[PDB]
Design a protein around this ligand. Structure first.
Ligand code: HEM
Ligand code: HEM
Ligand SMILES: N=C(NCCC[C@H](N)C(=O)N[C@H]1CN[C@H](C(N)=O)C1)N[N+](=O)[O-]
Ligand SMILES: N=C(NCCC[C@H](N)C(=O)N[C@H]1CN[C@H](C(N)=O)C1)N[N+](=O)[O-]
Ligand SMILES: C[C@H](O)[C@H](O)[C@H]1CNc2nc(N)[nH]c(=O)c2N1
Ligand SMILES: C[C@H](O)[C@H](O)[C@H]1CNc2nc(N)[nH]c(=O)c2N1
Ligand SMILES: OC[C@@H](O)[C@@H](O)[C@H](O)[C@H](O)CO
Ligand SMILES: OC[C@@H](O)[C@@H](O)[C@H](O)[C@H](O)CO
Ligand SMILES: [Zn+2]
Lengths: 410, 407
């Protein structure tokens, strides 16, 4: 079956065949679309075919499909699974797997960069202190004094489900959130629950508006442990505006390294529950969502006032005007401090070129329109006008329940 | 089987049972989502009519009554004998209002129950259609205090006597491709504009020329008509601070009136059913003016604001976008012509969704279309999960008549 996708601005029509290799389900049915829904131990039995599928893909990618090396590896893995109920990936396969999980992430607009991921193999790690060291090296490498480099650190895979490695933080670097007795929130509201857990575990919170959270690390299914990331390794950017000298006085700043640490990486049926990865920010993530979401820092009002905009009625679009200035501020500040960042126009333009390239060389590019289109100026970016097909390919990055809800305390 | 929808900004969760009544296909499968794709017999007829009449009698609190049963049998006998049937005026009104209620891509459905329905099923000619249409335009415009309305022409019979309004909207601007290779006017209408020119129309070759109606009655060839200029209300666009804005020479019409969709009620198909409400600001300022394939005026406006257009990161396109939209809203409001900004419209839709979930068990909604084309996340709908499914009565897309008409 062939599926056509059209861009309503350029009339370019693309054909998708990659979807035929989609295995996982989407949540939608022939009767209902769940496209805007945020979240819609294996058996030896259900494992070898997953391993075979992956290895076939891997060997085909290196032009050795059907080779003796390819056949020996399948036999080696099969015997290993039958013998130990699981199997170990070769370094090369792990690298290929991680890169493809990114290439297959339908909600990621930065995929033009997929082949350039630096993979850190942390499968020999056994303790939380060991995890801390690996993570510190990841942050220092990735940050690279502001010239950000994409990277992923992969800890030991799941075995029986009772010895999982987990990074309890949602991102390696985030600001604490504190709920005050009067119901207001100091800091980032998105992290109040995790902050309370950190405090309960012993963290002495400075209780400020931008306190970098400590790492809460779980190794081999044991209870998590707290670690403070060396401040000197945490690069931050004070936010100021090119024309508004009062902007800096808002006291805003943000960390330069976005590093998702709560997702699960699936490769050949194997599950890596601790696999922190990082790239670099698209400006709107900070300027639109982190600062302007009503449930986050929510700064639109204070910014609107200082600009003396007509806030008596929404039709003056005072929110929209302030929103633009704040995003100009984030981009300008990062660029001024020589810290990598990409604006939404550049990022979406690159994604379209990446997407067309993928259709040509791969036969498709699964993409989630709801997530790909930026949270501001949607239609003046090319992705708004691009029809996309969303499906799930493996290897992949998946959501997993927050650890505090499943962990068995010892 | 009982799906739940959550708003990630307010944490409010709503349960959806209404989707269990859906019949039509979405285009998606368990393996692939097509949520962003723009266009994904007597035996057939009675069940459709029955499904509809049941919902109708249920709405009037007389489900299972003799009247309900009588009507059901009357229609049943009518289909067996006439191969079709006629809706009672009450059923027609209820049907059109519900096709609007069920339009998953419409953000203004909080207004659904107030629709004015014009029954034009007694129309027989294109001149009669022109007359009904002028009356709709005048009624809906109401000197600037717009009122929602729909005019329903005769239903499909054998497919060879279909009534059709060839225009995409009752009111639009023409588009002509110039020698320069460029396009004068609205590029979206270039093809229709030529079918008119070629049909007889005399284009002023201007940037904003109100197109003529191309009306098709009973399957005959369509005919042209000029909507009384005095009935076409337009708004000159000026900025409340940039006095140079008016020099761009921009204007837009006050009445948005989709005229190419198909209204399906109880199995019956109404191929000519123009409807209208009023504009959401972004429709004109963001899409009509700034889309690259439309009037594409971002550069011109950026130049007049003297913004650094050297790098994308200065966000000049974004700043210009906001100004163009403030202008559109300011102009419509200054001229007392109804219009709604995206903040107000989305806030109303959230209220509507809640009303619908508690009084109907749900509300089909297409997030890709409901979220405004600018400032997405600062509008509440962005943070609102939505379930999309098809319910009848409904408004459907249909092939352009010129690719199907036999002259
Ligand atoms: C190099 C620059 C990169 C940019 C600019 C980029 C940009 C983005 C943005 C804007 C999002 C949406 C974030 C949100 O709204 O929460 C996203 C999501 C995502 N990206 Fe990328 N990304 C980059 C690198 C990476 C890397 C290194 C990986 C993995 C190796 C990755 C995997 C994903 C995944 C799985 C998601 C979805 C996460 C979720 O569902 O919450 N990205 N990316
Ligand atoms: C009174 C205020 C109304 C407002 C503010 C409103 C607003 C909207 C908007 C913004 C869209 C998207 C338009 C586009 O992007 O092309 C839309 C689509 C739609 N509306 Fe409404 N609407 C209103 C009244 C109506 C009425 C009176 C009906 C029917 C009787 C209706 C039926 C629909 C349908 C079927 C669509 C999708 C059409 C398509 O697929 O192109 N709307 N509406
Ligand atoms: N650019 C990113 N972005 C993703 C991380 C930052 C993102 N702005 C964020 O806060 N994501 C969280 C909150 N919402 C997502 C969710 N699923 O709830 C995860 N990563 N990268 O690898 O370069
Ligand atoms: N507000 C509207 N809007 C719908 C019509 C105006 C809209 N701005 C428009 O241009 N729609 C066209 C172009 N894209 C849609 C499509 N299906 O391609 C139809 N209608 N109403 O009844 O109040
Ligand atoms: C309900 C809706 O799915 C939700 O708000 C989505 C929409 N699009 C998004 N897009 C991105 N990039 N990130 C998000 O967190 C979201 N949230
Ligand atoms: C490809 C994509 O479906 C297309 O650009 C859609 C997106 N959302 C939209 N939303 C509205 N309201 N109107 C449109 O015309 C579109 N176009
Ligand atoms: O404060 C805890 C939250 O950050 C956490 O529950 C997130 O919602 C989750 O990790 C998804 O990012
Ligand atoms: O120029 C004719 C176009 O307006 C026409 O083909 C539309 O795209 C069609 O009616 C869908 O709205
Ligand atoms: Zn879907």
């Amino acid at each position: 079956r062939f599926l056509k996708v059209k861009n309503w601005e350029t009339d370019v029509v693309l054909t998708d065949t990659l979807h035929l290799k989609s295995t996982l389900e989407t949540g939608c049915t022939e009767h209902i679309c769940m496209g805007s829904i945020m979240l819609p131990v294996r058996t030896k039995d259900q494992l070898f075919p997953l391993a075979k599928e992956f290895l076939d893909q891997y060997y085909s990618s290196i032009k050795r499909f059907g080779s003796k090396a390819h056949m020996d590896r399948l036999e080696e893995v099969n015997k290993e699974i039958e013998s130990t109920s699981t199997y170990q990936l070769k370094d090369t396969e792990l690298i290929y797997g991680a890169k493809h999980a990114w290439r297959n992430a339908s909600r990621c607009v930065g995929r033009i960069q997929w082949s350039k991921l630096q993979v850190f193999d942390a499968r020999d790690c056994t303790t939380a202190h060991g995890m801390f060291n690996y993570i510190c090296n990841h942050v220092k490498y990735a940050t690279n004094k502001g010239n950000l480099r994409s990277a992923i650190t992969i800890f030991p895979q799941r075995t029986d489900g009772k010895h999982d490695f987990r990074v309890w933080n949602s991102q390696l670097i985030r600001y604490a959130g504190y709920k005050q007795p009067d119901g207001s929130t100091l800091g980032d509201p998105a992290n109040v629950q995790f902050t309370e857990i950190c405090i309960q575990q012993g963290w002495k919170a400075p209780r400020g508006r931008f306190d970098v959270l400590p790492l809460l690390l779980q190794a081999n299914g044991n209870d998590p442990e707290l670690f403070q990331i060396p401040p000197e390794l945490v690069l931050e950017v004070p936010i100021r505006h090119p024309k508004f000298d009062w902007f800096k006085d808002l006291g805003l700043k943000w960390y330069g390294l976005p590093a998702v640490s709560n997702m699960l990486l699936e490769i050949g049926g194997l599950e890596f529950s601790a696999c922190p990865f990082s790239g670099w920010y698209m400006g709107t993530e900070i300027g639109v969502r982190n600062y302007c979401d009503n449930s986050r820092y929510n700064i639109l009002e204070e910014v609107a006032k200082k600009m003396d905009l007509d806030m008596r009625k929404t039709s003056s679009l005072w929110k929209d005007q302030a929103l633009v200035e704040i995003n100009i501020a984030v981009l300008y500040s990062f660029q001024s401090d020589k810290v990598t960042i990409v604006d939404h126009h550049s990022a979406t333009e690159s994604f379209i070129k990446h997407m067309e390239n993928e259709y040509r060389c791969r036969g498709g590019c699964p993409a989630d329109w709801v997530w790909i289109v930026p949270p501001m100026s949607g239609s003046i970016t090319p992705v708004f006008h691009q029809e996309m097909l969303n499906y799930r390919l493996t290897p992949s990055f998946e959501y997993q329940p927050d650890p505090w809800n499943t962990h068995v305390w010892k």
